RNA sequence: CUUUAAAUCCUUUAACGAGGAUCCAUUGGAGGGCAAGUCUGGUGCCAGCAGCCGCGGUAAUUCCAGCUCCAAUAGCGUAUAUUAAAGUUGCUGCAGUUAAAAAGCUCGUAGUUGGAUCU
């Protein structure tokens, strides 16, 4: 069993947050990885993108730690990427999985041409950046697949993007920056104001206020 | 010096939109500027605007609704044909679901969709999305 | 006599900077996601 | 000056990445499920689908009321329906982009011979087609990559001169009965 | 910045054509000094007469003796140092016999730890080194 | 957000900043949702209903959040004219 | 630079004959063998996610 | 004597034609790039491999081999030219503070580009 240490975690625990989309709606940070577990079940698959050893020079020699880059996400609209450095590889991987869970972001899927069936591609051209690495995602016709490098391909498949064109620029050989720029581009999908989102936002009551009686009662 | 006042107008609108302001002062005003603003307004991107008349060259105060991602000019004004129009909207527009390319044609200034409907190419002025 | 066995994890931690860095990296990657 | 024709054409494309696990596994699964000889058959069907998708995209970029778009889209949709890879109900250029390589591998004479019960396994189907045991309508078809049209699906029989649908025993049965 | 004018096509074309000469590969291919100084004369292979057998010491990080042959090309009479690839393959080659020599794979650049050697031997006395090495063919005598 | 059949395919509809009408991202932890309590006309007491304003993190960072909330309240009849 | 040792190691490697084995199936049969080995057989794995030629 | 101007060639018929169906598939690889053994012998910075990083100095995942795996397959290596990769020639679409780079500065011709405004 898991005992929440946060108000949001406590609300999620006692079955009164219906979906992760509510937390995403009110921009509330996720501080416990158990919330993501509860909401997304075992549909969350994770893949260790990289294990890289980083060495710090010392008087006696070099102190080597290991940084794990782990991508996670159900292939239906949620993706996250975590990076954790530790003394041993197993702890680094476990922490990177935790941080990838804590960073799950909603992915907006759209259409290329005719809006037939489920959305398959990115809604529009979106660009992410990370330290000289620029990654641009472009809508592609149905059945195209992901036209990208292997690392963005993994990140985009985990996000649920069925097909997408991709352009990259910079030192993409730094897998960390490539992955983080792809993650930035993917997370930029729901921040783009398209004409279908011009409808004035009708506010709903926040969880910290919707169940304030529950929060004060226990 | 100052050339292609439409570039200055569109850059001013873009900068004021990025800063989150509600109004932008465009100067000088021009017929092409007013037509471009009308095309942008008919699609809901820009909202109302008023032309201040000074006796030399007017200014425009443009109210800003925060629906505009980017308004830009294409310089030089390449003479685009209808058969070559699609390539242009591949280079400038975010998706095929929204965004417009503004052309000036023998039938007036209008977006790419209206140019295709009227069956007339022209010269590309700019784009907005 | 017998010999002790090595997990891919400790193998990578020991041979991350050696002639066998490529092999231990590949075997660790195969451990972590090899399905 | 010769009266010959030099019009030839390659029917496949090799992948850009020689060795990647995902593609190798996918193509091996396709080979195993459809009993293909090598990866070149997978690449040939992939190339056919790629050309069809390219044509569909080129037509989709045209105006809806374009005579060329209407004519060529109708022709392509009728062709895809004719061989059985596209359902008659969904005859639209957009539904072409939803096709898969499996749909075109399903229409091979090998797959159809296996699916009609004429063979016990897909490899048995290939060997039967090669050994001249199968005919479509009245023509003895030998090529396992033969793509069956929808109107020829019900006319795949066991030939009239083969021991399996004829009645003349083969070389082995004749020799072994000669001992009695 | 670059000139963006409807009547700047001449300036853009001329500037690109002038700036292409600063591309190393383009100038190498088009100037014609490389093709003049190329011993093969633009060919992929060349036949030559083995002048002698030489041993080239490997570059500093690693130590060995690469068995090469100094040959004289039939076409232009130039002198060439061609690596003899496999082991024991210098024993197949003799003095003054004819060898087919190809490039080393780096388009004129020296390959690996052999310094100043950009050619390798493909055939000796009209029988390939591979067949002799694998025992598929004996040296004609 | 709608396909050809008219079904809503978006995972969710994000909030838009009450000032800039710009989408507030799922990870904008500097963004706020102010609730301002409405007040009875004759007694000046809490009615139980409030009006909400969503402000993005960029406007908060720029220091224009105060003027934004004041303008929203003024246009909303909560802060008196002048 | 001494040319005396040319083909030394290949010259003194103890010659070992190739063992006689059954012929390998070719064409569609070899691909079928690969497919059955790699996708129809899943039991023989020992849970270590190793390779097909691991001998440790 | 089906074809063809006269024999071909596969098409057709018939006889003989498979259990190591010996009627025996090869070419390159197995550290990474990059798919696939730090298995076993030999060698001991030698011989050699290695496009690149690198491997060999008496305990070689890399050479010489034996097994075993894997890539394409009646094909597969190698050299060279060239195209994409190269947004490393950049019109789309690069760069110029410190990584290569803005002329010492100004004038000035050709060139390029040129403010509103007329139903």
UniProtKB/Swiss-Prot annotation, chain B:
It comes from the Eukaryota. Pfam families: Ribosomal_S8. SUPFAM superfamilies: Ribosomal protein S8. Its main location: cytoplasm. GO terms for molecular function: RNA binding; structural constituent of ribosome. It is found in: Cytoplasm; Nucleus, Nucleolus. InterPro entries: Ribosomal_uS8, Ribosomal_uS8_CS, Ribosomal_uS8_sf. Signal peptide: none annotated. Gene3D superfamilies: 3.30.1370.30, 3.30.1490.10. GO terms for cellular component: cytoplasm; cytosol; cytosolic ribosome; cytosolic small ribosomal subunit; extracellular exosome; membrane; nucleolus; nucleoplasm. Keywords: Cytoplasm, Diamond-Blackfan anemia, Nucleus, Ribonucleoprotein, Ribosomal protein. The modification N6-succinyllysine is found at residue 87. GO terms for biological process: cytoplasmic translation; positive regulation of cell cycle; positive regulation of cell population proliferation; response to virus; ribosomal small subunit biogenesis; translation. Component of the 40S ribosomal subunit. Part of the small subunit (SSU) processome, composed of more than 70 proteins and the RNA chaperone small nucleolar RNA (snoRNA) U3. Belongs to the universal ribosomal protein uS8 family. This is Small ribosomal subunit protein uS8. It comes from Homo sapiens. The lineage of its organism: Eukaryota, Metazoa, Chordata, Craniata, Vertebrata. The gene is RPS15A.
From Swiss-Prot, chain D:
The modification N6-acetyllysine is found at residues 65, 115, 154. GO terms for molecular function: RNA binding; rRNA binding; structural constituent of ribosome; translation regulator activity. Residues 107-180 form the S4 RNA-binding domain. The modification Phosphoserine is found at residues 152, 162. The keyword Transcription does not apply. One of its GO terms (cellular component) is small-subunit processome. It holds the Pfam family Ribosomal_S4. Keywords: Acetylation, Cytoplasm, Isopeptide bond, Nucleus, Phosphoprotein, Ribonucleoprotein, Ribosomal protein, RNA-binding, rRNA-binding, Ubl conjugation. It is found in: Cytoplasm; Nucleus, Nucleolus. There is a cross-link at residues 92, 138 (Glycyl lysine isopeptide (Lys-Gly) (interchain with G-Cter in SUMO2)). Component of the small ribosomal subunit. The ribosome is a large ribonucleoprotein complex responsible for the synthesis of proteins in the cell. Part of the small subunit (SSU) processome, first precursor of the small eukaryotic ribosomal subunit. During the assembly of the SSU processome in the nucleolus, many ribosome biogenesis factors, an RNA chaperone and ribosomal proteins associate with the nascent pre-rRNA and work in concert to generate RNA folding, modifications, rearrangements and cleavage as well as targeted degradation of pre-ribosomal RNA by the RNA exosome. This is Small ribosomal subunit protein uS4.
Swiss-Prot record, chain E:
There is a cross-link at residue 36 (Glycyl lysine isopeptide (Lys-Gly) (interchain with G-Cter in SUMO2)). It comes from the Eukaryota. It is found in: Cytoplasm, Cytosol; Cytoplasm; Rough endoplasmic reticulum; Nucleus, Nucleolus. InterPro entries: NA-bd_OB-fold (IPR012340), Ribosomal_uS12 (IPR006032), Ribosomal_uS12_euk/arc (IPR005680). Changing residue 66 to K: In BTDD; decreases hydroxylation of the protein; decreases the accuracy of translation; decreases levels of incorporation of the mutant protein into ribosomes and polysomes; patient cells become highly sensitive to oxidative stress. The modification N6-succinyllysine is found at residue 53. One of its GO terms (biological process) is cytoplasmic translation. It comes from Homo sapiens (Human). The lineage of its organism: Eukaryota, Metazoa, Chordata, Craniata, Vertebrata. Changing residue 119 to I: In BTDD; decreases hydroxylation of the protein; decreases the accuracy of translation; decreases levels of incorporation of the mutant protein into polysomes; patient cells become highly sensitive to oxidative stress. The modification 3-hydroxyproline is found at residue 61. It is linked to Brachycephaly, trichomegaly, and developmental delay: An autosomal dominant developmental disorder characterized by brachycephaly, ciliary trichomegaly, dysmorphic features of the face and hands, hearing loss, and developmental delay with short stature. Intellectual disability and autism spectrum disorder may be present in some patients. The modification N6-acetyllysine is found at residue 134. Residues 1-19 have a biased composition (Basic residues). One of its GO terms (molecular function) is RNA binding. This is Small ribosomal subunit protein uS12.
Curated annotation (Swiss-Prot), chain G:
Component of the 40S subunit of the ribosome. Residues 7-33 are annotated as: Disordered. Coiled coil: none annotated. Component of the 40S subunit of the ribosome. Contributes to the assembly and function of 40S ribosomal subunits. Residues 20-33 have a biased composition (Basic residues). It is found in: Cytoplasm; Nucleus. It comes from Homo sapiens. The chain holds residues 78 to 133 of 133 of the full protein. The modification N6-succinyllysine is found at residue 48. This is Small ribosomal subunit protein eS30. It comes from the Eukaryota.
């Amino acid at each position: 069993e898991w005992m929440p240490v946060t108000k949001l975690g406590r609300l999620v625990k006692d079955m009164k947050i219906k979906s992760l989309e509510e937390i995403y709606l009110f921009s509330l940070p996720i501080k416990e990885s158990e919330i993501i577990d509860f909401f997304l079940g075992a549909s969350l698959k994770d893949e260790v993108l990289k294990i890289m050893p980083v060495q710090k020079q010392t008087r006696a020699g070099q102190r080597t730690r290991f940084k794990a880059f782990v991508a996670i996400g159900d292939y239906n609209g949620h993706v996250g990427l975590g990076v954790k450095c530790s003394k041993e590889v197993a702890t680094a991987i476990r922490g990177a999985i935790i941080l990838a869970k804590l960073s799950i972001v909603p992915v907006r899927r759209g259409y290329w041409g005719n809006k037939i069936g489920k959305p398959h591609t990115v809604p529009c051209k979106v660009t992410g950046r990370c330290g000289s690495v620029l990654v641009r995602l472009i809508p592609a016709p149905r059945g195209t697949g992901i036209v990208s490098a292997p690392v963005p391909k993994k990140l985009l498949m985990m996000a649920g993007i069925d097909d997408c064109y991709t352009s990259a620029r910079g030192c993409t050989a730094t897998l960390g920056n490539f992955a983080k720029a792809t993650f930035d581009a993917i997370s930029k999908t729901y921040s783009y104001l398209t004409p279908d989102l011009w409808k004035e936002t009708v506010f709903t009551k926040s969880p910290y206020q919707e169940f304030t009686d529950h929060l004060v009662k226990t | 010096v100052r050339m292609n006042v439409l570039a200055d107008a569109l850059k001013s609108i873009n900068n004021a939109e990025k800063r989150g302001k509600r109004q932008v002062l465009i100067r000088p005003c021009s017929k092409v500027i007013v037509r471009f603003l009308t095309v942008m307004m008919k699609h809901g991107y820009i909202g109302e605007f008023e032309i201040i008349d000074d006796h030399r060259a007017g200014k425009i105060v443009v109210n800003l609704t925060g629906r505009l991602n980017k308004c830009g000019v294409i310089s030089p004004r390449f003479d685009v044909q209808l058969k070559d129009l699609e390539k242009w909207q591949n280079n400038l527009l975010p998706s095929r679901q929204f965004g417009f390319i503004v052309l000036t044609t023998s039938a007036g200034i209008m977006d790419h969709e209206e140019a295709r409907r009227k069956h007339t190419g022209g010269k590309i002025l700019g784009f907005f999305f | 006599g017998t010999d002790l066995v090595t997990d891919p994890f400790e193998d990578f931690e020991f041979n991350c900077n050696t002639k066998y860095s490529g092999g231990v990296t590949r075997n660790l990657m195969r451990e972590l996601n090899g399905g | 000056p010769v009266a010959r024709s030099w019009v030839c054409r390659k029917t496949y494309v090799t992948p850009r990445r020689p060795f990647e696990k995902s593609r190798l596994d996918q193509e091996l699964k396709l080979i195993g499920e459809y009993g293909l000889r090598n990866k070149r058959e997978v690449w040939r069907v992939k190339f056919t689908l790629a050309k069809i998708r390219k044509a569909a995209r080129e037509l989709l970029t045209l105006d809806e009321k374009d005579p060329r778009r209407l004519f060529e889209g109708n022709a392509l949709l009728r062709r895809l329906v004719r061989i059985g890879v596209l359902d008659e109900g969904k005859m639209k250029l957009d539904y072409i982009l939803g096709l898969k390589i499996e749909d075109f591998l399903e229409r091979r004479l090998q797959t159809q011979v296996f699916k009609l019960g004429l063979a016990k396994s897909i490899h048995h189907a290939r060997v039967l087609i090669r050994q001249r045991h199968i005919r479509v309508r009245k023509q003895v078809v030998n090529i396992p990559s033969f793509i069956v049209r929808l109107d020829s699906q019900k006319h795949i029989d066991f030939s009239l001169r083969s021991p399996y649908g004829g009645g003349r025993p083969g070389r082995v049965k004749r020799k072994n009965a000669k001992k009695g | 910045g670059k000139c963006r004018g409807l009547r700047t096509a001449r300036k853009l074309r001329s500037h690109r054509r002038d700036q292409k000469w600063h591309d190393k590969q383009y100038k190498k291919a088009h100037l014609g000094t490389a093709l003049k100084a190329n011993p093969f004369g633009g060919a992929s292979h060349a036949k030559g007469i083995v002048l002698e057998k030489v041993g080239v010491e490997a570059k500093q990080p690693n130590s060995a003796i690469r068995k090469c042959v100094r040959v004289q090309l039939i076409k232009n009479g130039k002198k060439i140092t061609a690596f003899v690839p496999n082991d024991g393959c210098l024993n197949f080659i003799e003095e003054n016999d004819e060898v087919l020599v190809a490039g080393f794979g780096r388009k004129g650049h020296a390959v690996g730890d052999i310094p100043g050697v950009r050619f390798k031997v493909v055939k000796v006395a009209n029988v390939s080194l591979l067949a002799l090495y694998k025992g598929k063919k004996e040296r004609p005598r | 957000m709608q396909n050809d059949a008219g079904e809503f395919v978006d995972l969710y509809v994000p909030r838009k900043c009450s000032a800039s009408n710009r989408i507030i991202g799922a990870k904008d932890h500097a963004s706020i949702q102010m609730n301002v309590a409405e007040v009875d006309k004759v007694t000046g007491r809490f009615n139980g209903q409030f009006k909400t304003y969503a402000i993005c993190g960029a406007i908060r960072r720029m220091g224009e959040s105060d003027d934004s909330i004041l303008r929203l309240a003024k246009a909303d009849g909560i802060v008196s004219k002048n | 630079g001494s040319l005396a040792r040319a083909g030394k190691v290949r010259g003194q490697t103890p010659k070992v004959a190739k063992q006689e084995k059954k012929k390998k199936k070719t064409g569609r049969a070899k691909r079928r063998m690969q497919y059955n080995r790699r996708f129809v057989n899943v039991v023989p794995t020992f849970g270590k996610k190793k390779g097909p030629n691991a001998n440790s």
